Nucleic acid binder design. Structure first.
Lengths: 62, 27, 205, 19, 134, 41, 91, 247, 206, 128, 38
RNA sequence: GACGGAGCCAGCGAGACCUUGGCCGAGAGGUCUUGGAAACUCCGUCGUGCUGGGGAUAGAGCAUUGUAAUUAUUGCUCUUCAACGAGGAAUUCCUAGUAAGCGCAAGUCAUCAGCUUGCGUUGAUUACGUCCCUGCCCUUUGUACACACCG
């Protein structure tokens, strides 16, 4: 199963690797649970990402 | 003075015409 | 000039290099950037509130800048000019983008949505045209020519109905709820319109 | 003539223009 | 009220080309099967049987749109690209086509040079135009 | 005034012992000391 | 400079700024009297505002924008001859 | 809008005529187009090329940038010349640089100053560009020091003022980059150096490019305006063209 | 209850084909495919696969490169047509792409009775990978919906391109096979193979 | 005289002149039916006004379009844009301003380029 | 035969040597023709 | 995509020779008179075969231009039918009418002779975010007129 999480906020000054953005997303199934994730493409707030794994916590990738 | 001047890092062949002209101050 | 209304003092004054005549002014929601427009320079001067210097000059208009406004939320600047177009400036950020939207006739007034998602403009033809800021496409338009009341001046040698002196609105503003526009100009009428459905709610003498 | 063509104000009036 | 220009160009030319073939009165030169219609061309027209009749049909329609036409106009009108040269179409075929049409009476010698759409030919192109529509 | 009314599309009005009442006050309740910053003092 | 101002200023300088005199130099009207008639009849706009006073004088930032009102019958004859009369602009 | 430029052109031509008369009377400061913004607003330069530029010209256009601190590059793909100037004036650009090549060899360079001129045209010879230097490295983009040599005639100061305002004002006294324009028989040698102040002298270092510039046309107007009155023109068919110096 | 807007039979002096009035009733792609029933199956692809605004033919002459996300508002069919022209020789020939796409939808309808636009949107949804990798070795990250639709378009078009690159099959029919196989989710489609490969490599480097 | 009105539509160098008068539903471009416009694939664009507002508003008028300059697509855009302008202006001059208002609303809601010129003036995206 | 225009100069070493020699002289004296804030 | 038919749309440009038109030839090209664009659209043939892609070399002819030679020069017809099947190590450039494809016109003091410029036509993908790597810089007397933040 794959979960869906809506981006609430694009984090700035995270210094992630070029082309990688650190964002915060709240799961659609439960609005409360919020997870920090790394994305490769263009992103904005209110955008929903498909999280196939919901347990991993995003770490800075240099 | 000879080192940091690539025009006279090194330039590609053919940028300078010094060898040609000096032949003619001889000629 | 910037004024502190707790102590009532002019704590700073701003001016151009060549004493440009200013007719409109706009202020960033953060209160850190102030932009003014002129009828003679065609350029929008940008300053920094804290330091008092000229950050930069926003060029791009081929006509005088008639009005300015900062979006309250998104902080975008929308500028209007007699050059028959409206320009949307994303001054804040690493890269600066400008999105021009051309307009039918000369724009005289501009009002910005408290949401910051829409902008309405009053033009010389007597039209209040409402554009979507993000998509830069028209979403609404209201006729104002007929509703406006203009009286024949005593010296007019031509009739009021045939007169074309002022059937436009030189000033417009939104209602904070966002469903109405109050419009005014060099005339004997204030007209209150409804944006979503495009009618006259009521007119005042 | 080219300068003369370049700076033609497009809006010029005369009375002969009626015919 | 039907006219040539009311009908699609290809539909009119294809239809009128067939009628010239069925009519059998349009003179065709013997060398049609051995010519390419242009120096820029490399092999002769594939539809050997009726390309000349289609050639006449297009030319007759061209006479209709423009009152006066000459061989030079048809040559550059039918020319094509080859550094490019833009060689004009073969002059030989166009003259025979223009001569062939006026034998039937479709066209006739213009004043001040060229060919006109003869009134009989102009009415002719109108009957075919109505036929395609109907 | 004169060239302004010549050059004005729009109406331009003409510009205009005993102790004196100063009628326009640039607040009457504010104190001058309260108008100075802690840095200025 | 001020030194010039005691001699540059003239009555002729003020009159050339008069709207009908501006009207003529632009070739907008053939004669000054013709310009006065058009101004009075209300067929001439300067920027957003219409002027019915012939004695109005134009400033240097402003002369670029003197023109006929959008719905002037004069502005129709303009574009009618040149065959550029666009109804959609109502002119 | 068209009326404004038409009027200002007449004012500009009148100003130069009055300035020319004043100079002639003096014969018996900074130039007027630049006097308004001389040392007040930093210059804005837009660098472009001719239609369908070769790869080398694009590289050369890229290099003319790094010479000028405030240069921006614009692809001239199908841009129409009145359309180009109007957009550049609209964006507030002060100077426009257009480059010409022949088989990937730069041939001419023209500089046009906005909003009403002047326009100066140069011919390019002995162009030695930096991509031709192996392992050369990147430039320093600080505000450079400027040197002008053998500009003696009135035309000499005139060309200097055009080239002078292409750069920013107030270079740091220890600014480590220097650009020199050396006039030698009307052939202005242009070069870029980076140095080190040594205990017993100074040592410089070539960054490039090398290119010898000769003015041949100078008009009072934008480079688009081919009707612009010619302030000065180069005469090549003169019999004394063999030995005439102007700069 | 009834509301009627016409009292008189409409007859135009210029004849117009009956199909054109049937189009006046509703806007349909090429007048043959309707967008009323098309909906994006996956919620994530919604707001980026734009199909709500009906268009008769792909060409629009719109401005979508101005800001960073006008491309989402673009009709997906326009995106297919624009992506289809590539390889230099085909650059700038949008009309060729429009015709190729018309033949492709005709082929899709012929093989499968489902609406071809539904097949296209299903393929775009299925072939959008959900995780990918970035060079540090490789590290796994998630994929933005816009970047998903961009890959989907690119992979489908390029697969159709090399499939008929030196093969008897023409561009239209190979594109139709590509789209239908992608919509089915079968591994036969090139784009599904690379989608699965990218997701598997992301799985390895998680 | 017969109520008639004239509009222009511009796209790149293509310029189209549309004359709209009272009539019986006769639409021509260069004096040919709008059904014969070329390219055929793009042809629906010339009908795109024709399809949005209904053909009765045409059944009560005739329209004649003459187009010159530019390339094929530019003529197509000029034709549709000029037609739409002609409809709105005719409905202004000889019909109520409401029918004009719904008409403008329809075009602007669908595609604003149908009524206003699309001129892609150059902009230096890089500041300066 | 006579020539009509200048022979285009050739950048020989002594032309270079004379040229950077002065550039060292200008910078030694800090003599720059550079525009300054006004 | 190659080829045959048919349909057609521009903007720059003016120091006897050009010409609209008629008559010859398959073409090139001739003769007798008047005035001073492609790409691209439709319908068709062919077909994964170094094939109807590629036209280098070669042979035989039909003409033009000069000049006085059996001299070359520029085109047309047929036949002959090569390398080339997407390109290594490396490398250069590029963000909207932009890359790219397409044709046209003028040689207007520098440079250019199928080279230069200008003109018009069709027309995109992706990014429009970051200092994570690289490189180039600025600051480390708030000095800055309120509020706020800082020390």
């Amino acid at each position: 199963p794959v979960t869906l999480a809506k981006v609430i906020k694009v984090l700035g000054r995270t210094g992630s690797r070029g082309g990688v953005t650190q964002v915060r997303v709240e799961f659609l199934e439960d609005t409360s649970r919020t997870i920090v994730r790394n994305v490769k493409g263009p992103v904005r707030e209110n955008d929903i990402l498909v999280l196939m794994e919901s347990e991993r916590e995003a770490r800075r990738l240099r | 003075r000879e080192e940091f001047n690539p025009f006279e890092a090194v330039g590609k062949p053919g940028i300078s015409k010094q060898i040609g002209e000096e032949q003619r101050k001889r000629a | 000039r910037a004024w502190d209304l707790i102590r009532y003092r002019n704590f700073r004054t701003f001016t151009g290099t060549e004493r440009i005549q200013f007719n409109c002014l706009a202020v960033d929601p953060s209160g850190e950037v102030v932009c003014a427009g002129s009828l003679d320079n065609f350029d929008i001067h940008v300053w920094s509130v804290q330091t008092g210097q000229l950050l930069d000059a926003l060029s791009g208009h081929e006509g005088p800048v008639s009005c300015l406004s900062f979006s309250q939320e998104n902080s975008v600047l929308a500028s209007a000019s007699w050059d028959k177009t409206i320009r949307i400036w994303s001054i804040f950020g690493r890269s600066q983008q400008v999105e021009p939207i051309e307009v039918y006739s000369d724009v005289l007034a501009l009002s910005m949505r408290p949401d910051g998602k829409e902008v309405a403009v009053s033009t010389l033809k007597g039209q209040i045209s409402i554009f979507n800021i993000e998509d830069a496409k028209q979403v609404g338009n209201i006729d104002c020519r007929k509703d406006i009341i203009s009286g024949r001046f005593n010296q007019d040698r031509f009739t009021a109905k045939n007169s074309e002196r002022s059937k436009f609105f030189t000033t417009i503003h939104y209602s904070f709820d966002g469903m109405a526009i109050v419009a005014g100009g060099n005339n004997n009428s204030i007209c209150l319109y409804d944006v979503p459905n495009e009618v006259l709610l009521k007119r005042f003498i | 003539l080219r300068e003369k063509a370049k700076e033609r104000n497009p809006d010029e009036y005369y009375h002969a223009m009626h015919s | 009220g039907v006219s040539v220009r009311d009908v699609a160009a290809q539909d009119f030319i294809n239809a009128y080309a067939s009628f010239l073939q069925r009519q059998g009165k349009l003179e065709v030169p013997g060398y049609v099967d051995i010519v390419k219609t242009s120096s820029g061309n490399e092999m002769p027209p594939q539809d050997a049987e009726g390309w000349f009749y289609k050639r006449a049909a297009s030319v007759a329609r061209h006479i209709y749109m423009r009152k006066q036409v000459g061989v030079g106009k048809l040559n550059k009108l039918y020319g094509g690209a080859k550094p490019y040269k833009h060689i004009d179409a073969s002059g030989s075929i166009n003259r025979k086509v223009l001569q062939a049409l006026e034998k039937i009476g479709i066209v006739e010698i213009s004043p001040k040079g060229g060919r006109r759409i003869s009134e009989n030919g102009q009415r002719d192109l109108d009957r075919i135009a109505a036929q395609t529509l109907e | 005034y004169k060239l302004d009314v010549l050059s004005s599309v729009h109406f331009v009005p003409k510009p205009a012992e005993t102790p004196t009442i100063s009628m326009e006050d640039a607040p009457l309740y504010m104190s001058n000391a309260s108008s100075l910053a802690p840095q200025e003092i | 400079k001020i030194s010039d101002l005691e001699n540059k200023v003239t009555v002729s300088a003020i009159c050339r700024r008069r709207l009908p005199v501006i009207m003529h130099r632009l070739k907008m009207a053939e004669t000054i009297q013709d310009a006065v008639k058009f101004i009075e009849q209300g067929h001439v706009r300067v920027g957003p505002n219409l002027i019915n006073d012939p004695a109005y004088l134009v400033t240097r930032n402003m002369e670029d924008y003197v023109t006929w009102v959008d719905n002037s019958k004069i502005k129709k004859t303009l574009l009618r001859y040149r065959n550029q009369i666009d109804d959609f602009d109502f002119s | 809008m068209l009326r404004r430029q038409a009027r200002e052109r007449r004012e500009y031509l009148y100003r130069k005529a009055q300035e020319l008369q004043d100079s002639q009377l003096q014969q018996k400061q900074v130039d007027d187009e630049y006097a308004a913004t001389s040392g007040i607003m930093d210059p804005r330069i837009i660098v472009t090329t001719s239609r369908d530029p070769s790869t080398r010209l694009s590289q050369f256009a890229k290099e003319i940038k790094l010479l000028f601190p405030n240069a921006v590059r614009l692809n001239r793909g199908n841009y129409v010349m009145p359309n180009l100037v109007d957009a550049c004036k609209k964006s507030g650009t002060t100077d426009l640089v257009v480059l010409h090549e022949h088989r990937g060899v730069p041939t001419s360079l023209t500089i046009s100053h906005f909003p009403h001129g002047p326009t100066a045209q140069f011919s390019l010879h002995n162009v030695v560009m930096r991509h031709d230097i192996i392992n050369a490295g990147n430039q320093s983009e600080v505000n450079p020091h400027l040197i002008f040599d053998n500009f003696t005639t009135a035309l000499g100061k005139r060309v200097v003022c055009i080239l002078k305002h292409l750069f920013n004002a107030g270079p740091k006294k220890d600014s480590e980059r220097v650009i020199t324009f050396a006039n030698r028989g009307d052939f202005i040698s242009v070069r870029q150096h980076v140095y080190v102040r040594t205990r017993e002298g100074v040592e410089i270092a070539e960054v490039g490019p090398r290119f010898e510039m000769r003015l041949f046309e100078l008009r009072l107007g934008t480079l688009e305006n081919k009707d612009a009155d010619v302030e000065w023109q180069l005469r090549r068919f003169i019999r004394t063209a063999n030995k005439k110096d102007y700069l | 209850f009834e509301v009627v807007e016409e009292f008189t039979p409409v007859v135009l002096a210029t004849p117009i084909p009956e199909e054109v009035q049937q189009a006046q009733t509703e806007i349909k792609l090429f007048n043959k495919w309707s967008f009323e029933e098309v909906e994006v199956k996956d919620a994530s692809l919604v707001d980026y696969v734009q199909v709500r605004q009906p268009i008769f033919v792909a060409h629009t002459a719109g401005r979508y490169a101005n800001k960073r996300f006008r491309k989402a508002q673009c009709p997906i069919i326009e995106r297919l047509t624009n992506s289809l022209m590539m390889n230099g020789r085909n650059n700038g020939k949008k009309l060729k792409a429009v015709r190729i796409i018309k033949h492709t939808l005709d082929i899709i309808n012929v093989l499968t009775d489902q609406n071809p636009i539904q097949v296209v949107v299903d393929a775009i949804t299925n072939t959008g990978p959900r995780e990918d990798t970035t060079r540090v070795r490789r590290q796994a990250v998630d994929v933005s919906p816009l970047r998903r639709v961009n890959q989907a378009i690119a992979l489908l078009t390029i697969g159709a391109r090399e499939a008929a690159f030196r093969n008897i099959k023409t561009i239209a029919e190979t594109l139709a096979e590509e789209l239908i196989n992608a919509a089915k989710g079968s591994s036969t489609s090139y784009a599904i193979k690379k989608k699965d490969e990218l997701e598997r490599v992301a799985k390895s480097n998680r | 005289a017969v109520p008639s009105v004239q509009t222009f539509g511009k796209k790149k160098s293509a310029t189209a002149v549309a004359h709209v008068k009272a009539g019986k539903g006769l639409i021509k471009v260069n004096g040919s039916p709008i059904t014969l416009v070329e390219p055929e694939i793009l042809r629906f664009k010339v009908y795109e006004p024709l399809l949005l507002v209904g053909l009765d508003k045409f059944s009560n008028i005739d329209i004649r379009v003459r187009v010159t300059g530019g390339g094929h697509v530019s003529q197509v855009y000029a034709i549709r844009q000029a037609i739409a302008k002609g409809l709105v202006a005719y409905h202004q001059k000889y019909v109520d301003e409401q029918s004009k208002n719904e008409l403008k609303k329809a075009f602007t809601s669908y595609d604003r380029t149908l009524l206003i010129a699309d001129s892609r003036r150059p902009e230096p995206k890089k500041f300066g | 035969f006579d020539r009509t225009a200048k022979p285009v100069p050739v950048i020989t070493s002594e032309v270079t040597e004379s040229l950077e020699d002065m550039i060292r002289r200008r910078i030694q004296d800090s003599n720059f023709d550079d525009l300054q804030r006004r």
